[PDB]
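Design request, C-alpha coordinates follow.
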Protein backbone atom coordinates (compact mmCIF):
# COMPACT_ATOMS: atom_id res chain seq x y z
CA UNK A 1 0.00 0.00 0.00
CA UNK A 2 1.15 3.56 -0.69
CA UNK A 3 2.25 6.29 1.74
CA UNK A 4 -0.10 8.78 0.07
CA UNK A 5 -0.97 12.04 1.81
CA UNK A 6 -3.72 12.79 -0.74
CA UNK A 7 -7.48 12.22 -0.73
CA UNK A 8 -9.63 10.43 -3.30
CA UNK A 9 -13.15 11.58 -4.20
CA UNK A 10 -15.72 8.98 -5.31
CA UNK A 11 -18.29 11.43 -6.80
CA UNK A 12 -17.87 13.34 -10.07
CA UNK A 13 -17.83 17.11 -9.54
CA UNK A 14 -20.84 19.15 -10.57
CA UNK A 15 -21.39 22.87 -10.06
CA UNK A 16 -21.92 22.45 -6.30
CA UNK A 17 -18.71 20.47 -5.72
CA UNK A 18 -16.75 23.05 -7.73
CA UNK A 19 -18.03 25.73 -5.31
CA UNK A 20 -17.29 23.88 -2.06
CA UNK A 21 -14.41 21.55 -2.93
CA UNK A 22 -12.10 24.18 -4.39
CA UNK A 23 -8.39 23.37 -4.75
CA UNK A 24 -7.60 25.42 -1.64
CA UNK A 25 -10.46 23.96 0.43
CA UNK A 26 -9.38 20.43 -0.46
CA UNK A 27 -5.72 21.17 0.36
CA UNK A 28 -6.80 22.30 3.84
CA UNK A 29 -9.14 19.32 4.31
CA UNK A 30 -6.31 17.01 3.21
CA UNK A 31 -3.98 18.46 5.85
CA UNK A 32 -6.55 17.93 8.59
CA UNK A 33 -7.23 14.37 7.48
CA UNK A 34 -3.59 13.25 7.37
CA UNK A 35 -2.69 15.08 10.60
CA UNK A 36 -5.67 13.98 12.72
CA UNK A 37 -7.27 10.81 11.34
CA UNK A 38 -4.77 8.39 12.91
CA UNK A 39 -5.43 9.88 16.37
CA UNK A 40 -9.19 9.81 15.71
CA UNK A 41 -8.95 6.09 14.91
CA UNK A 42 -6.98 5.50 18.12
CA UNK A 43 -9.72 7.34 20.05
CA UNK A 44 -12.34 5.00 18.57
CA UNK A 45 -10.18 2.02 19.62
CA UNK A 46 -9.88 3.48 23.14
CA UNK A 47 -13.69 3.59 23.32
CA UNK A 48 -13.81 -0.15 22.64
CA UNK A 49 -11.41 -0.87 25.52
CA UNK A 50 -13.19 1.46 27.97
CA UNK A 51 -16.50 -0.25 27.16
CA UNK A 52 -14.96 -3.71 27.65
CA UNK A 53 -13.85 -2.62 31.14
CA UNK A 54 -17.41 -1.51 31.96
CA UNK A 55 -18.94 -4.70 30.47
CA UNK A 56 -16.55 -6.66 32.69
CA UNK A 57 -18.10 -5.18 35.83
CA UNK A 58 -16.41 -1.88 36.74
CA UNK A 59 -18.97 0.93 36.72
CA UNK A 60 -17.94 4.40 35.56
CA UNK A 61 -16.94 7.07 38.08
CA UNK A 62 -14.89 10.27 38.20
CA UNK A 63 -11.19 10.08 37.31
CA UNK A 64 -8.89 9.91 40.36
CA UNK A 65 -5.63 11.09 38.72
CA UNK A 66 -7.04 14.43 37.47
CA UNK A 67 -8.29 15.53 40.92
CA UNK A 68 -5.88 18.48 40.78
CA UNK A 69 -7.69 19.90 37.72
CA UNK A 70 -11.13 19.56 39.31
CA UNK A 71 -10.12 21.11 42.65
CA UNK A 72 -8.21 24.07 41.19
CA UNK A 73 -9.67 27.46 40.28
CA UNK A 74 -9.56 28.33 36.56
CA UNK A 75 -11.95 29.33 33.81
CA UNK A 76 -12.40 28.96 30.07
CA UNK A 77 -10.50 31.41 27.87
CA UNK A 78 -13.59 33.44 26.99
CA UNK A 79 -16.94 33.92 25.32
CA UNK A 80 -17.38 36.28 22.35
CA UNK A 81 -19.91 39.11 22.55
CA UNK A 82 -22.51 37.43 20.35
CA UNK A 83 -22.49 34.23 22.47
CA UNK A 84 -23.16 35.99 25.83
CA UNK A 85 -26.95 35.65 25.39
CA UNK A 86 -28.17 32.25 24.18
CA UNK A 87 -31.44 32.00 26.08
CA UNK A 88 -33.16 30.15 23.22
CA UNK A 89 -31.58 28.30 20.31
CA UNK A 90 -33.35 26.59 17.46
CA UNK A 91 -31.92 23.47 15.83
CA UNK A 92 -32.57 22.17 12.36
CA UNK A 93 -31.36 20.78 9.03
CA UNK A 94 -29.03 22.54 6.59
CA UNK A 95 -31.68 22.55 3.80
CA UNK A 96 -32.02 25.99 2.22
CA UNK A 97 -35.56 27.07 3.18
CA UNK A 98 -35.14 25.64 6.72
CA UNK A 99 -31.94 27.64 7.22
CA UNK A 100 -33.72 30.88 6.29
CA UNK A 101 -36.73 30.15 8.51
CA UNK A 102 -34.52 29.24 11.47
CA UNK A 103 -32.31 32.33 11.17
CA UNK A 104 -35.49 34.46 11.00
CA UNK A 105 -37.07 32.89 14.11
CA UNK A 106 -37.27 34.83 17.42
CA UNK A 107 -34.24 33.05 18.89
CA UNK A 108 -30.66 34.00 19.73
CA UNK A 109 -28.91 31.16 17.87
CA UNK A 110 -29.56 28.70 15.05
CA UNK A 111 -27.66 25.41 15.21
CA UNK A 112 -27.46 24.21 11.62
CA UNK A 113 -27.18 20.44 11.81
CA UNK A 114 -25.06 18.00 9.77
CA UNK A 115 -25.52 15.39 12.54
CA UNK A 116 -28.64 13.68 13.98
CA UNK A 117 -31.27 15.69 12.09
CA UNK A 118 -29.50 15.07 8.71
CA UNK A 119 -29.56 11.88 6.65
CA UNK A 120 -26.05 12.54 5.26
CA UNK A 121 -26.56 12.06 1.54
CA UNK A 122 -23.62 13.51 -0.38
CA UNK A 123 -25.81 16.04 -2.20
CA UNK A 124 -27.37 17.19 1.06
CA UNK A 125 -23.99 17.65 2.80
CA UNK A 126 -22.62 19.66 -0.16
CA UNK A 127 -25.87 21.66 -0.50
CA UNK A 128 -25.69 22.28 3.24
CA UNK A 129 -22.25 23.88 2.91
CA UNK A 130 -23.49 26.02 -0.01
CA UNK A 131 -26.49 27.13 2.08
CA UNK A 132 -24.46 28.01 5.17
CA UNK A 133 -21.98 30.06 3.10
CA UNK A 134 -24.89 32.00 1.55
CA UNK A 135 -26.37 32.47 5.05
CA UNK A 136 -23.10 33.79 6.51
CA UNK A 137 -22.82 36.17 3.54
CA UNK A 138 -26.43 37.32 4.08
CA UNK A 139 -27.60 36.47 0.55
CA UNK A 140 -29.36 33.14 1.10
CA UNK A 141 -32.80 33.10 -0.50
CA UNK A 142 -35.39 30.59 -1.62
CA UNK A 143 -38.46 30.84 -3.85
CA UNK A 144 -41.04 28.07 -3.61
CA UNK A 145 -43.23 26.68 -6.40
CA UNK A 146 -46.06 29.07 -5.43
CA UNK A 147 -43.71 32.03 -6.06
CA UNK A 148 -43.20 33.04 -2.43
CA UNK A 149 -39.69 34.30 -1.72
CA UNK A 150 -37.92 33.73 1.61
CA UNK A 151 -35.04 36.05 2.57
CA UNK A 152 -33.14 36.94 5.74
CA UNK A 153 -34.63 39.62 7.98
CA UNK A 154 -32.26 42.25 9.40
CA UNK A 155 -30.11 41.00 12.30
CA UNK A 156 -30.53 37.21 11.90
CA UNK A 157 -29.76 34.75 14.68
CA UNK A 158 -26.14 33.77 15.32
CA UNK A 159 -25.13 30.69 13.30
CA UNK A 160 -23.44 27.63 14.83
CA UNK A 161 -22.56 24.48 12.82
CA UNK A 162 -23.07 20.99 14.31
CA UNK A 163 -20.66 18.47 12.81
CA UNK A 164 -21.04 14.70 12.53
CA UNK A 165 -19.75 12.66 15.49
CA UNK A 166 -16.37 10.97 15.67
CA UNK A 167 -17.69 7.52 14.71
CA UNK A 168 -19.20 8.62 11.38
CA UNK A 169 -17.44 8.10 8.03
CA UNK A 170 -17.75 10.41 5.05
CA UNK A 171 -17.66 7.54 2.55
CA UNK A 172 -17.37 9.71 -0.58
CA UNK A 173 -13.90 10.98 0.38
CA UNK A 174 -11.14 8.50 1.24
CA UNK A 175 -7.58 8.52 2.52
CA UNK A 176 -5.47 5.37 2.00
CA UNK A 177 -8.61 3.55 0.87
CA UNK A 178 -10.66 4.33 4.00
CA UNK A 179 -13.49 6.84 4.48
CA UNK A 180 -12.33 10.05 6.13
CA UNK A 181 -13.94 11.25 9.38
CA UNK A 182 -17.23 13.07 8.70
CA UNK A 183 -16.35 15.23 11.72
CA UNK A 184 -13.34 16.64 9.85
CA UNK A 185 -15.20 17.07 6.55
CA UNK A 186 -18.01 19.12 8.11
CA UNK A 187 -15.67 21.16 10.33
CA UNK A 188 -13.10 21.87 7.60
CA UNK A 189 -15.52 23.15 5.00
CA UNK A 190 -17.74 25.33 7.24
CA UNK A 191 -14.63 26.83 8.86
CA UNK A 192 -12.71 27.36 5.62
CA UNK A 193 -15.52 28.94 3.62
CA UNK A 194 -16.82 31.21 6.37
CA UNK A 195 -14.23 32.22 8.97
CA UNK A 196 -13.29 35.47 7.20
CA UNK A 197 -16.85 36.80 6.73
CA UNK A 198 -17.95 35.60 10.18
CA UNK A 199 -15.06 37.44 11.84
CA UNK A 200 -15.48 40.59 9.72
CA UNK A 201 -19.13 41.02 10.78
CA UNK A 202 -18.49 40.64 14.52
CA UNK A 203 -19.21 36.91 14.81
CA UNK A 204 -16.89 33.92 14.43
CA UNK A 205 -16.53 30.28 13.36
CA UNK A 206 -18.70 28.45 15.89
CA UNK A 207 -19.35 24.71 16.23
CA UNK A 208 -21.51 22.26 18.09
CA UNK A 209 -19.74 18.98 18.94
CA UNK A 210 -21.87 15.86 19.54
CA UNK A 211 -21.50 12.51 21.28
CA UNK A 212 -18.12 13.12 22.97
CA UNK A 213 -17.14 10.36 25.41
CA UNK A 214 -13.81 11.52 26.92
CA UNK A 215 -11.57 14.45 27.69
CA UNK A 216 -8.99 12.99 25.28
CA UNK A 217 -11.58 13.41 22.50
CA UNK A 218 -12.00 17.04 23.60
CA UNK A 219 -8.18 17.42 23.50
CA UNK A 220 -8.21 16.10 19.91
CA UNK A 221 -10.78 18.75 18.98
CA UNK A 222 -8.59 21.43 20.57
CA UNK A 223 -5.65 20.23 18.41
CA UNK A 224 -7.81 20.31 15.28
CA UNK A 225 -9.05 23.82 16.12
CA UNK A 226 -5.54 25.05 16.96
CA UNK A 227 -4.20 23.68 13.66
CA UNK A 228 -6.98 25.49 11.76
CA UNK A 229 -6.38 28.74 13.67
CA UNK A 230 -2.62 28.61 13.10
CA UNK A 231 -3.01 27.74 9.39
CA UNK A 232 -4.90 31.02 8.79
CA UNK A 233 -3.01 33.06 11.40
CA UNK A 234 -5.98 33.43 13.77
CA UNK A 235 -5.47 34.07 17.48
CA UNK A 236 -5.89 31.09 19.79
CA UNK A 237 -9.54 30.59 20.73
CA UNK A 238 -11.07 32.23 17.66
CA UNK A 239 -12.96 29.00 16.97
CA UNK A 240 -15.61 28.50 19.67
CA UNK A 241 -17.35 25.21 20.40
CA UNK A 242 -20.34 24.18 22.47
CA UNK A 243 -20.14 20.52 23.48
CA UNK A 244 -23.11 18.25 24.20
CA UNK A 245 -22.82 15.98 27.23
CA UNK A 246 -25.05 13.28 25.78
CA UNK A 247 -23.14 10.10 26.64
CA UNK A 248 -22.86 8.41 30.02
CA UNK A 249 -19.03 8.30 29.93
CA UNK A 250 -18.88 12.08 29.36
CA UNK A 251 -20.91 12.96 32.47
CA UNK A 252 -17.93 11.83 34.59
CA UNK A 253 -15.43 13.96 32.62
CA UNK A 254 -17.16 17.34 32.20
CA UNK A 255 -14.49 19.32 34.04
CA UNK A 256 -11.63 17.57 32.19
CA UNK A 257 -13.47 18.21 28.90
CA UNK A 258 -13.81 21.93 29.76
CA UNK A 259 -10.10 21.99 30.65
CA UNK A 260 -8.88 20.12 27.56
CA UNK A 261 -10.90 22.44 25.30
CA UNK A 262 -10.51 25.56 27.47
CA UNK A 263 -9.21 27.78 24.63
CA UNK A 264 -12.24 27.03 22.45
CA UNK A 265 -15.14 25.83 24.61
CA UNK A 266 -18.00 28.15 25.64
CA UNK A 267 -20.61 25.74 27.02
CA UNK A 268 -21.95 22.24 27.62
CA UNK A 269 -25.49 20.93 26.99
CA UNK A 270 -27.90 18.55 28.70
CA UNK A 271 -30.20 16.42 26.60
CA UNK A 272 -32.52 13.49 27.12
CA UNK A 273 -32.59 10.90 24.33
CA UNK A 274 -28.91 10.50 23.35
CA UNK A 275 -27.99 10.43 27.05
CA UNK A 276 -30.40 7.64 28.05
CA UNK A 277 -29.55 5.77 24.80
CA UNK A 278 -25.94 5.96 25.95
CA UNK A 279 -26.87 4.93 29.52
CA UNK A 280 -28.29 1.69 28.15
CA UNK A 281 -25.42 1.08 25.69
CA UNK A 282 -22.83 1.73 28.38
CA UNK A 283 -24.57 -0.43 31.00
CA UNK A 284 -25.84 -2.99 28.46
CA UNK A 285 -24.51 -6.03 30.34
CA UNK A 286 -25.87 -5.02 33.80
CA UNK A 287 -29.12 -6.81 34.75
CA UNK A 288 -29.83 -4.25 37.50
CA UNK A 289 -29.60 -1.23 35.15
CA UNK A 290 -32.69 -1.88 33.00
CA UNK A 291 -34.62 1.32 32.31
CA UNK A 292 -38.43 1.37 32.13
CA UNK A 293 -40.45 2.89 29.25
CA UNK A 294 -38.25 5.65 27.80
CA UNK A 295 -41.42 7.78 27.66
CA UNK A 296 -41.35 7.65 31.51
CA UNK A 297 -37.61 8.39 31.83
CA UNK A 298 -38.08 12.13 32.25
CA UNK A 299 -35.56 14.84 33.17
CA UNK A 300 -37.00 15.16 36.70
CA UNK A 301 -36.04 11.56 37.58
CA UNK A 302 -33.26 11.50 40.20
CA UNK A 303 -30.39 10.35 37.94
CA UNK A 304 -31.25 12.88 35.23
CA UNK A 305 -31.81 15.74 37.68
CA UNK A 306 -28.39 14.93 39.18
CA UNK A 307 -26.92 15.11 35.65
CA UNK A 308 -28.56 18.53 35.08
CA UNK A 309 -27.42 20.00 38.39
CA UNK A 310 -23.87 18.67 38.06
CA UNK A 311 -23.55 20.03 34.52
CA UNK A 312 -24.81 23.47 35.58
CA UNK A 313 -22.49 23.63 38.61
CA UNK A 314 -19.47 22.45 36.63
CA UNK A 315 -20.00 24.81 33.71
CA UNK A 316 -20.55 27.85 35.89
CA UNK A 317 -17.44 27.07 38.00
CA UNK A 318 -15.47 27.48 34.75
CA UNK A 319 -17.40 30.46 33.32
CA UNK A 320 -19.02 28.30 30.62
CA UNK A 321 -22.67 28.14 29.57
CA UNK A 322 -24.91 25.29 30.73
CA UNK A 323 -27.60 24.70 28.11
CA UNK A 324 -30.87 22.89 28.75
CA UNK A 325 -32.66 20.42 26.51
CA UNK A 326 -35.15 20.20 23.68
CA UNK A 327 -38.85 20.97 23.33
CA UNK A 328 -39.59 19.27 19.99
CA UNK A 329 -43.35 19.98 19.74
CA UNK A 330 -44.81 21.11 16.43
CA UNK A 331 -47.56 23.58 17.37
CA UNK A 332 -50.75 24.18 15.42
CA UNK A 333 -51.06 27.31 13.29
CA UNK A 334 -54.20 27.97 15.37
CA UNK A 335 -53.18 29.21 18.85
CA UNK A 336 -56.50 27.97 20.30
CA UNK A 337 -55.31 24.37 19.83
CA UNK A 338 -51.90 24.79 21.55
CA UNK A 339 -52.78 25.24 25.24
CA UNK A 340 -51.66 21.78 26.41
CA UNK A 341 -48.37 21.82 24.49
CA UNK A 342 -47.49 25.39 25.50
CA UNK A 343 -48.30 24.64 29.16
CA UNK A 344 -45.90 21.68 28.97
CA UNK A 345 -43.21 23.84 27.33
CA UNK A 346 -43.65 26.51 30.02
CA UNK A 347 -43.36 23.94 32.83
CA UNK A 348 -40.26 22.27 31.36
CA UNK A 349 -38.45 25.48 30.48
CA UNK A 350 -39.28 26.96 33.90
CA UNK A 351 -37.66 23.89 35.53
CA UNK A 352 -34.51 24.43 33.46
CA UNK A 353 -34.33 28.18 34.10
CA UNK A 354 -34.93 27.68 37.83
CA UNK A 355 -32.09 25.12 37.93
CA UNK A 356 -29.71 27.73 36.44
CA UNK A 357 -29.54 26.85 32.73
CA UNK A 358 -28.37 29.75 30.55
CA UNK A 359 -30.59 28.77 27.64
CA UNK A 360 -32.58 26.01 26.02
CA UNK A 361 -33.55 24.34 22.73
CA UNK A 362 -36.54 24.28 20.40
CA UNK A 363 -37.04 22.55 17.04
CA UNK A 364 -39.87 24.70 15.64
CA UNK A 365 -40.12 28.52 15.31
CA UNK A 366 -43.68 28.44 16.74
CA UNK A 367 -42.27 27.68 20.21
CA UNK A 368 -39.78 30.57 20.18
CA UNK A 369 -41.88 33.32 21.77
CA UNK A 370 -43.11 31.00 24.56
CA UNK A 371 -39.61 29.66 25.37
CA UNK A 372 -38.13 33.16 25.16
CA UNK A 373 -40.80 34.50 27.56
CA UNK A 374 -39.95 31.91 30.24
CA UNK A 375 -36.25 32.80 30.11
CA UNK A 376 -36.91 36.56 29.78
CA UNK A 377 -39.03 36.46 32.95
CA UNK A 378 -36.55 34.51 35.06
CA UNK A 379 -33.42 36.27 33.68
CA UNK A 380 -34.87 39.75 34.19
CA UNK A 381 -32.14 42.06 32.90
CA UNK A 382 -29.43 39.33 33.04
CA UNK A 383 -27.99 38.04 29.75
CA UNK A 384 -27.33 34.60 31.23
CA UNK A 385 -27.09 32.71 34.54
CA UNK A 386 -23.30 32.35 34.78
CA UNK A 387 -23.42 33.59 38.40
CA UNK A 388 -25.68 30.70 39.51
CA UNK A 389 -23.09 28.45 41.17
CA UNK A 390 -25.37 25.89 42.90
CA UNK A 391 -22.94 26.03 45.86
CA UNK A 392 -25.69 24.82 48.22
CA UNK A 393 -25.97 21.47 46.40
CA UNK A 394 -24.43 18.49 48.15
CA UNK A 395 -21.85 16.56 46.12
CA UNK A 396 -23.22 14.54 43.20
CA UNK A 397 -21.91 10.98 43.10
CA UNK A 398 -21.59 8.21 40.54
CA UNK A 399 -24.14 6.16 42.49
CA UNK A 400 -26.65 8.99 42.01
CA UNK A 401 -25.84 9.47 38.32
CA UNK A 402 -26.11 5.72 37.64
CA UNK A 403 -29.32 4.95 39.58
CA UNK A 404 -32.05 3.59 37.27
CA UNK A 405 -35.39 5.37 37.75
CA UNK A 406 -38.76 3.90 38.73
CA UNK A 407 -41.35 3.03 36.11
CA UNK A 408 -42.98 0.24 34.12
CA UNK A 409 -41.98 -1.59 30.93
CA UNK A 410 -45.28 -1.53 29.05
CA UNK A 411 -46.68 -3.08 25.91
CA UNK A 412 -48.12 0.30 24.90
CA UNK A 413 -44.68 1.90 25.27
CA UNK A 414 -42.99 -0.87 23.30
CA UNK A 415 -45.48 -0.63 20.44
CA UNK A 416 -45.11 3.18 20.38
CA UNK A 417 -41.31 2.80 20.23
CA UNK A 418 -41.72 0.53 17.21
CA UNK A 419 -44.05 2.94 15.40
CA UNK A 420 -41.88 6.00 16.04
CA UNK A 421 -38.57 4.27 15.21
CA UNK A 422 -39.88 2.69 11.99
CA UNK A 423 -41.37 5.98 10.80
CA UNK A 424 -38.12 7.80 11.63
CA UNK A 425 -36.02 5.22 9.77
CA UNK A 426 -38.35 5.26 6.74
CA UNK A 427 -37.87 9.03 6.42
CA UNK A 428 -34.11 8.83 7.07
CA UNK A 429 -33.43 6.22 4.37
CA UNK A 430 -35.50 8.46 2.03
CA UNK A 431 -33.13 11.36 2.81
CA UNK A 432 -34.97 13.19 5.64
CA UNK A 433 -33.45 12.95 9.13
CA UNK A 434 -35.65 15.62 10.76
CA UNK A 435 -39.07 14.03 10.83
CA UNK A 436 -42.51 15.14 12.09
CA UNK A 437 -43.97 12.12 13.90
CA UNK A 438 -47.08 12.36 16.12
CA UNK A 439 -46.63 16.12 16.57
CA UNK A 440 -42.91 16.01 17.45
CA UNK A 441 -39.90 16.92 15.31
CA UNK A 442 -37.79 13.79 15.75
CA UNK A 443 -34.10 13.20 15.05
CA UNK A 444 -32.04 10.01 15.08
CA UNK A 445 -31.66 9.85 18.87
CA UNK A 446 -35.39 9.11 19.21
CA UNK A 447 -35.04 6.04 17.00
CA UNK A 448 -31.85 5.07 18.88
CA UNK A 449 -33.43 5.05 22.35
CA UNK A 450 -36.51 3.27 20.96
CA UNK A 451 -34.58 0.33 19.47
CA UNK A 452 -31.98 0.20 22.25
CA UNK A 453 -34.56 0.01 25.05
CA UNK A 454 -36.22 -2.96 23.33
CA UNK A 455 -32.81 -4.60 22.83
CA UNK A 456 -32.10 -4.21 26.56
CA UNK A 457 -35.39 -5.90 27.53
CA UNK A 458 -34.70 -8.81 25.15
CA UNK A 459 -31.09 -9.16 26.31
CA UNK A 460 -31.96 -9.36 30.02
CA UNK A 461 -35.07 -11.49 29.38
CA UNK A 462 -37.38 -8.96 31.02
CA UNK A 463 -41.15 -9.14 31.28
CA UNK A 464 -43.56 -6.39 30.34
CA UNK A 465 -45.81 -5.13 33.15
CA UNK A 466 -48.60 -7.36 31.78
CA UNK A 467 -46.39 -10.44 32.30
CA UNK A 468 -45.37 -11.06 28.66
CA UNK A 469 -41.71 -12.10 28.31
CA UNK A 470 -39.89 -9.74 25.93
CA UNK A 471 -38.26 -11.86 23.22
CA UNK A 472 -37.10 -11.50 19.62
CA UNK A 473 -40.25 -13.40 18.58
CA UNK A 474 -42.53 -11.03 20.52
CA UNK A 475 -40.80 -8.04 18.93
CA UNK A 476 -41.19 -9.50 15.41
CA UNK A 477 -44.90 -10.16 16.02
CA UNK A 478 -45.42 -6.63 17.33
CA UNK A 479 -43.41 -5.16 14.44
CA UNK A 480 -45.77 -6.76 11.89
CA UNK A 481 -48.81 -5.57 13.84
CA UNK A 482 -47.57 -1.98 14.22
CA UNK A 483 -46.74 -1.78 10.49
CA UNK A 484 -50.48 -2.25 9.89
CA UNK A 485 -51.21 0.55 12.38
CA UNK A 486 -48.79 2.87 10.53
CA UNK A 487 -50.47 1.91 7.23
CA UNK A 488 -53.92 2.81 8.62
CA UNK A 489 -52.65 6.15 9.96
CA UNK A 490 -50.86 7.25 6.77
CA UNK A 491 -53.21 5.73 4.18
CA UNK A 492 -52.53 3.34 1.30
CA UNK A 493 -50.88 5.88 -1.04
CA UNK A 494 -48.27 7.19 1.42
CA UNK A 495 -47.56 3.75 2.89
CA UNK A 496 -47.22 1.69 -0.32
CA UNK A 497 -45.09 4.34 -2.07
CA UNK A 498 -42.90 4.82 1.03
CA UNK A 499 -39.85 2.82 2.13
CA UNK A 500 -41.55 1.08 5.06
CA UNK A 501 -40.54 -2.45 4.01
CA UNK A 502 -36.88 -1.42 4.12
CA UNK A 503 -37.37 0.55 7.36
CA UNK A 504 -38.97 -2.44 9.12
CA UNK A 505 -36.10 -4.67 7.95
CA UNK A 506 -33.45 -2.29 9.31
CA UNK A 507 -35.40 -1.93 12.57
CA UNK A 508 -35.56 -5.73 12.90
CA UNK A 509 -31.85 -6.06 12.08
CA UNK A 510 -30.75 -3.51 14.71
CA UNK A 511 -33.18 -4.65 17.44
CA UNK A 512 -32.91 -8.47 17.23
CA UNK A 513 -29.12 -8.78 16.86
CA UNK A 514 -27.32 -10.57 19.71
CA UNK A 515 -24.75 -7.76 19.93
CA UNK A 516 -25.93 -4.20 20.61
CA UNK A 517 -24.74 -2.15 17.65
CA UNK A 518 -23.41 1.28 18.60
CA UNK A 519 -25.38 3.44 16.12
CA UNK A 520 -28.19 2.69 13.66
CA UNK A 521 -26.74 5.33 11.32
CA UNK A 522 -23.83 3.05 10.46
CA UNK A 523 -25.93 0.28 8.82
CA UNK A 524 -28.39 2.98 7.66
CA UNK A 525 -25.65 4.84 5.77
CA UNK A 526 -25.22 1.79 3.49
CA UNK A 527 -28.68 2.56 2.06
CA UNK A 528 -27.63 6.07 0.96
CA UNK A 529 -25.82 6.60 -2.36
MG1 LIG B 1 2.47 19.21 9.23
MG1 LIG C 1 -3.77 23.76 22.93
MG1 LIG D 1 -27.99 14.20 20.42
Amino acid sequence: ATTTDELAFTRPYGEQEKQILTAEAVEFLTELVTHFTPQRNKLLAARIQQQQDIDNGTLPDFISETASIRDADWKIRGIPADLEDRRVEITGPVERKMVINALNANVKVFMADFEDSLAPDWNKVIDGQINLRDAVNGTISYTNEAGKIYQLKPNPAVLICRVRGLHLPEKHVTWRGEAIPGSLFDFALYFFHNYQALLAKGSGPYFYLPKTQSWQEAAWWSEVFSYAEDRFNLPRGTIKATLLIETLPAVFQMDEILHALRDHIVGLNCGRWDYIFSYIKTLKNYPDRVLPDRQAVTMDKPFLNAYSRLLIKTCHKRGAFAMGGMAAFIPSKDEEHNNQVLNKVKADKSLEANNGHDGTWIAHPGLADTAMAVFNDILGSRKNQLEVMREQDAPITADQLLAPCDGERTEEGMRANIRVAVQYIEAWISGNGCVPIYGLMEDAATAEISRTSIWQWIHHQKTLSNGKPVTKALFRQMLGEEMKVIASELGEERFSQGRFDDAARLMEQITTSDELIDFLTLPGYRLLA
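Comment from the thread starter after seeing the answer: thanks! The radius of gyration is 22 Å.
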